[PDB]
């Protein structure tokens, strides 16, 4: 550990060639995304054999005995898989292959072509249907499979195709179809747009086609589904339906996908993945263009995956809310009322429902003060997700191959606030799949979202940043060794821990100086802390505190030897920080820093007097002192004022730093003090340490229990965390990098104190985070 471990690191990723390579990847990615963000190549989605076969059914509008879109028939004839099914070869999903193959077989028969393909398709369907022994064999179901497949299979039955209609699994599916159809409000089909519009081709006996146009989308589609629209067209001759089908053929050539457009969901998925891979800083322009488009279509009624959907989609809407808010757009959690009653979202195909609830769960964590609906959403999504873990569908072959249960479990144990940013990006680089397949009417892929380039850049960029930090850690530990701080043997040496506290969140190459000075100050502070609350005597501390007031090196002749040294190092670090800040800021700051240091250490001295008198403060007193004395404020200031290119006027600084006000530095200090207390008060109580916030409350409330006391501390912490979030994301003219630096340091602090049982901080978990974040690179 420390000096020896760090100087043994020799990362190759430091060489300029790696960053130059990463820049080529950045340019390639910009070029790849351009059609989706700026051009007309939006909605890049794979073919749906199933939908293509429905479009192929449409007879020529000139009345001739041939398809209106003969290129789709040609496509189908040419794209059968080796096993006789139609679908995407990379991924096998039984329900997808069954539905698509039966769909294709039937249209080839309609046009009396493809005898061989039909023969091979029928064999696939028969042979695979006979492999199903029980329900656990069926695997994940494509959208509305239970409704559509029995309908499509009855069409085959009327043609007397050689299929096993009498299998128990087939009877079960009809049973499931009835179950679904029974909850249907049929009269309302025509008045209130619903998810079933996506699959009208499966409920043809139910729909009065003469009334269904009322819920048609503006582009002529039925909930963006080519199959569903083709069906309505063949029943009605509706011009707008035909226009939709034409527009999709024009866009894709000789096939159609199972959803179109997916303009909103695709843009959001692109941004989500770029952000989670930790590569967002390279694509500010593209993220802004993408989110601006989404925001244009954002409305009080929510959004669908496609901007023309006549009903909102929770998945897209929850994702949109989170990414928009995170990027400082103004959105209200009131949009979630669109998914309530008397919360529902228990209808639809399983993967979509789970995705919607994962997204709702993550969105709920971005709550601002007073947003009760998000607390409700959090509770609801949590319960949903825990139940989903117990459902057999979650353990289907399809879901297991994608590690769904692992993903759900990870989401539930992960608090957005209590996250290490660099670590989350590293971890996502290890989970992201370039060939990820999604499910709707058929299995599909979105290559703008899931591709090799994203991952290539993710892993490389992570490794480069890490190697840069490793060189910085050599500088840190080298400075530390010669700094004099190791001479204070009453204090633990933790230079890497403090470097991690800042570098795990504020990682960009240009902020080397910020990280360096922040680490120096934190190293000094741990000594000052041990000195005031443990090692020093009150009379010694009174002397040190007077020296603090005087700012005079000559005055230290009066101090004990160890304090003479401590004062010298303190004085040097304070003024090095101040010089750097004045350089970056172009205005005087020595006086402001000095006042900050005095208030902080006078805070320690007040606490030292309490300890000496065995005084237990009121909770109000303890928190007041703690906000000032815990040390986060002066430490944060020591970093935030020396960020390359980040100008903070007094006016701007006061927006994020203002003792006595609920601004970023104040909230961080409050949260740090109380989170620490919740994590540590029990070990400290046992050791006989001076009272914490818990103990102070109990003195204030003699009859209250320890349990009530701890609950009260959390009742202070939780509101404070929401305010922190709002202060961070709030639109203003404070350089965002500065606000982010403050917020991210708070987030890493919260990681250290997460899950406060009172026992103490896990020193081993800290080491593991440092190892993961700063020591071990990603294999390429």
Residue 408 near residue 375 (C-beta atoms within 8 A): no
Window 133-162: contact mask with ligand FPS (x via CB under 6 A): ------------------------------
Window 677-696: contact mask with Mg ion (x via CB under 5 A): ---x----------------
Site membership for Cl ion, residue 436 (CB under 5 A): yes
Among ligand FPS, Cl ion, Mg ion, none, residue 394 binds (CB under 5-8 Å by kind): none
Nearest approach, Cβ of residue 630 and ligand FPS (Å): 5
Q: Cα–Cα distance between 674 and 714 in angstroms, integer? A: 8
Nearest approach, Cβ of residue 530 and Mg ion (Å): 6
Q: Which stretch binds ligand FPS (CB under 6 A): 56-64, 175-183, 193-201, 522-530?
A: 522-530
Q: State how beta strands 443-444 and 438-439 pair.
A: antiparallel
Backbone angles phi, psi at 659, to 5 degrees: -50, 135
Distance of CA 172 to the CA centre of its chain: 39
SS3 of residue 29 by DSSP: helix
Q: What is the number of other CB atoms lying within 10 angstroms of the CB of residue 79?
A: 17
Tell me how long the chain is: 780
Query: Following DSSP, what letter does each residue of 314-325 receive, concatenated?
Result: HHHHHHHHHHHH
What is the size of the binding site for Cl ion (CB under 5 A)? 3
Both tokens assigned to 262: 């997916």
Q: What element of type H or E holds 736?
A: helix 736-752
Site membership for ligand FPS, residue 526 (CB under 6 A): yes
Q: Cα–Cα distance between 232 and 242 in angstroms, integer? A: 10
Nearest approach, Cβ of residue 588 and ligand FPS (Å): 25
Q: Which stretch binds ligand FPS (CB under 6 A): 46-54, 167-175, 558-566, 631-639?
A: 631-639
If the CB atoms of residues 316 and 525 are measured against ligand FPS, the closer one turns out to be: 525
Question: Among 676, 723, 744, 745, which residue interacts with Mg ion (rule: CB under 5 A)?
Answer: 676
Backbone angles phi, psi at 142, to 5 degrees: -60, 160
Site membership for Mg ion, residue 672 (CB under 5 A): no
Window 529-558: contact mask with ligand FPS (x via CB under 6 A): x---x-------------------------
Site membership for ligand FPS, residue 525 (CB under 6 A): yes
Under DSSP, the state recorded for 531 is I
Window 574-613: contact mask with ligand FPS (x via CB under 6 A): ----------------------------------------
If the CB atoms of residues 529 and 772 are measured against Mg ion, the closer one turns out to be: 529
Q: Cα–Cα distance between 403 and 393 in angstroms, integer? A: 12
Among ligand FPS, Cl ion, Mg ion, none, residue 463 binds (CB under 5-8 Å by kind): none
- Interface positions, 332-371, toward Cl ion (CB under 5 A): none
Q: Which stretch binds Cl ion (CB under 5 A): 197-205, 426-434, 459-467, 651-659?
A: 426-434
Residue 260 near residue 221 (C-beta atoms within 8 A): yes
Q: What is the number of other CB atoms lying within 10 angstroms of the CB of residue 80?
A: 23
The residue behind tokens 């629209």 is 229
If the CB atoms of residues 440 and 548 are measured against Mg ion, the closer one turns out to be: 548
Cβ contacts of residue 317 below 8 Å, gap of 6+?
A: 302, 303, 335, 336, 338, 339
SS3 of residue 160 by DSSP: coil
Nearest approach, Cβ of residue 28 and Cl ion (Å): 23
Buried b (16+ CB within 10 A) or exposed e, 305-334: bbbbbbbbbbbbbbbbbbbbbbbebebebe
Site membership for ligand FPS, residue 625 (CB under 6 A): no
Site membership for Cl ion, residue 535 (CB under 5 A): no
Site membership for Mg ion, residue 669 (CB under 5 A): no
Nearest approach, Cβ of residue 571 and Mg ion (Å): 21
Q: Which stretch binds Mg ion (CB under 5 A): 19-27, 392-400, 530-538, 551-559?
A: 530-538
Question: Among 272, 529, 599, 609, which residue interacts with Mg ion (rule: CB under 5 A)?
Answer: 529
**Taking CB positions, which residue lies at the least distance from Mg ion?**
680
The residue behind tokens 């429902």 is 353
Under DSSP, the state recorded for 47 is -
Q: Cα–Cα distance between 577 and 707 in angstroms, integer? A: 43
Q: Is the dihedral of CA 86, 90, 91, 92 positive or negative?
A: positive
Site membership for ligand FPS, residue 621 (CB under 6 A): no
The partner residues of 745 in beta bridges, in order of sequence, read: none
Nearest approach, Cβ of residue 759 and ligand FPS (Å): 14
If the CB atoms of residues 222 and 432 are measured against Cl ion, the closer one turns out to be: 432
Nearest approach, Cβ of residue 355 and ligand FPS (Å): 37
Q: Which stretch binds Mg ion (CB under 5 A): 305-313, 380-388, 527-535, 695-703?
A: 527-535
Under DSSP, the state recorded for 45 is -
The partner residues of 225 in beta bridges, in order of sequence, read: 222
If the CB atoms of residues 377 and 521 are measured against ligand FPS, the closer one turns out to be: 521
Question: How would you classify residue 270: left for phi > 0, otherwise alpha for psi between -120 and 50, otherwise beta?
Answer: alpha
Among Cl ion, ligand FPS, Mg ion, none, residue 436 binds (CB under 5-8 Å by kind): Cl ion
Buried b (16+ CB within 10 A) or exposed e, 718-744: eebbbbbbbbbbeeeebbebbbbbbbb
* Contacting positions for Cl ion (CB under 5 A): 433, 436-437
Bind-site residues for Mg(2+)? 529, 533, 676, 680, 684
* Contacting positions for Mg ion (CB under 5 A): 529, 533, 676, 680
* Contacting positions for ligand FPS (CB under 6 A): 522, 525-526, 529, 533, 630-632, 635, 672, 676, 749
Bind-site residues? 529, 533, 676, 680, 684
């Amino acid at each position: 550990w420390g000096y020896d471990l760090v100087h043994s690191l020799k990362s190759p990723y430091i060489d300029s060639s790696y960053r130059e390579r990463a820049e080529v990847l950045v340019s390639e990615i910009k070029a790849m995304l351009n059609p989706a963000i700026t051009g007309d190549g939006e909605s890049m989605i794979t073919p749906s054999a199933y939908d293509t076969a429905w479009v192929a059914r449409v007879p020529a509008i000139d009345g001739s005995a041939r398809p209106q879109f003969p290129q789709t028939v040609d496509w189908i004839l040419k794209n059968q898989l080796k096993d006789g099914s139609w679908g995407i070869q990379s991924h096998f999903l039984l329900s997808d292959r069954l539905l698509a193959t039966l769909s294709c077989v039937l249209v080839l028969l309609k046009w009396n072509v493809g005898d061989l393909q039909v023969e091979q398709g029928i064999e696939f369907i028969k042979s695979n249907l006979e492999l199903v022994k029980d329900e656990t064999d069926q695997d994940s179901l494509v959208t509305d499979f239970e409704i559509i497949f029995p309908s499509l299979l009855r069409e085959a039955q009327s043609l007397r195709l050689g299929l096993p209609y009498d299998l128990p699994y087939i009877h079960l599916l009809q049973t499931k179809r009835q179950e679904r159809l029974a909850k249907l409000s049929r009269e309302e089909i025509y008045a209130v747009p619903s998810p079933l519009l996506y699959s009208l081709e499966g409920i043809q006996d139910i729909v009065e086609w003469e009334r269904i146009m009322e819920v048609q989308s503006q582009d002529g589609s039925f909930l963006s589904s080519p199959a569903s629209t083709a069906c309505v067209f063949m029943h009605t001759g509706d011009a707008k339906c035909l226009e939709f089908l034409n527009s999709v053929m024009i866009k894709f050539g000789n096939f159609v996908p199972c959803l179109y457009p997916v303009d909103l969901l695709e843009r959001l998925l692109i941004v989500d993945n770029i952000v989670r891979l930790g590569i967002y800083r390279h694509f500010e322009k593209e993220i802004k263009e993408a989110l601006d488009y989404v925001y244009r279509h954002w409305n009080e009624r929510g959004i669908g995956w496609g901007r023309l959907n006549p009903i909102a989609d929770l998945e897209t809407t929850a994702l949109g809310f989170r990414l928009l808010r995170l990027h400082r757009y103004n959105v209200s959690p009131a949009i979630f009322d669109n998914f309530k009653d008397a919360f529902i979202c228990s209808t639809g195909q399983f993967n979509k429902d789970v995705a919607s609830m994962l997204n709702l769960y993550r969105a709920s964590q971005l709550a601002f003060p007073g947003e009760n609906i998000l607390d409700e959403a959090k509770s609801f999504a949590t319960k949903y997700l825990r139940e989903a873990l117990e459902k057999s569908e979650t353990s289907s072959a399809w879901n297991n191959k994608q590690n769904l249960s692992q993903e759900i479990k990870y989401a539930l144990k992960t608090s957005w606030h209590a996250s290490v940013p660099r670590v989350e990006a590293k971890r996502y680089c290890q989970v992201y799949r370039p060939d990820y397949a999604r499910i709707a009417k058929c299995v599909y892929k979105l290559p703008y979202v899931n591709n090799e380039k994203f991952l290539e850049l993710g892993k490389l960029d992570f490794n480069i940043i890490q190697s840069i930090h490793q060189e910085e850690m050599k500088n840190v530990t080298s400075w530390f060794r010669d700094s004099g701080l190791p001479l204070f043997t009453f204090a633990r040496e933790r230079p890497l821990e403090f470097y991690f506290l800042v570098a795990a969140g504020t990682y960009e190459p240009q902020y080397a100086k910020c990280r360096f000075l922040f680490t120096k100050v934190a190293c000094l502070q741990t000594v000052l802390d041990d000195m005031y609350d443990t090692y020093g005597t009150l009379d010694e501390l009174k002397l040190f505190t007077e020296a603090v007031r005087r700012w005079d090196l000559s005055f230290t002749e009066n101090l004990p030897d160890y304090m003479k040294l401590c004062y010298q190092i303190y004085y040097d670090i304070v003024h090095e920080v101040a010089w750097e800040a004045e350089k970056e800021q172009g205005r005087e700051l020595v006086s402001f820093f000095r006042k900050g240091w005095e208030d902080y250490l006078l805070g320690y001295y007040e606490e030292a007097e309490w300890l000496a008198a065995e005084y237990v403060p009121t909770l109000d007193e303890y928190i007041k002192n703690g906000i000032t004395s815990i040390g986060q404020r002066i430490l944060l200031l020591s970093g935030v004022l020396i960020m390359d290119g980040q100008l903070l006027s007094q006016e701007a600084l006061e927006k994020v730093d203002y003792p006595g006000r609920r601004v970023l530095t104040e909230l961080n200090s409050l949260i740090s003090r109380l989170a620490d207390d919740t994590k540590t008060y029990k070990a400290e109580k046992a050791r006989g340490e001076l009272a914490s916030s818990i103990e102070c409350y109990m003195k204030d409330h003699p009859e209250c229990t320890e349990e009530e006391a701890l609950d009260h501390i959390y009742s202070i912490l939780e509101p404070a965390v929401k305010e922190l979030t709002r202060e961070f994301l709030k639109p203003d003219d404070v350089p965002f990098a500065c606000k982010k630096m403050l917020f991210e340091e708070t987030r890493v602090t919260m990681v250290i104190f997460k899950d406060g049982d009172g026992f103490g901080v896990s020193k081993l978990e800290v080491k593991d985070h440092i190892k993961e974040c700063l020591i071990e690179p990603l294999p390429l």
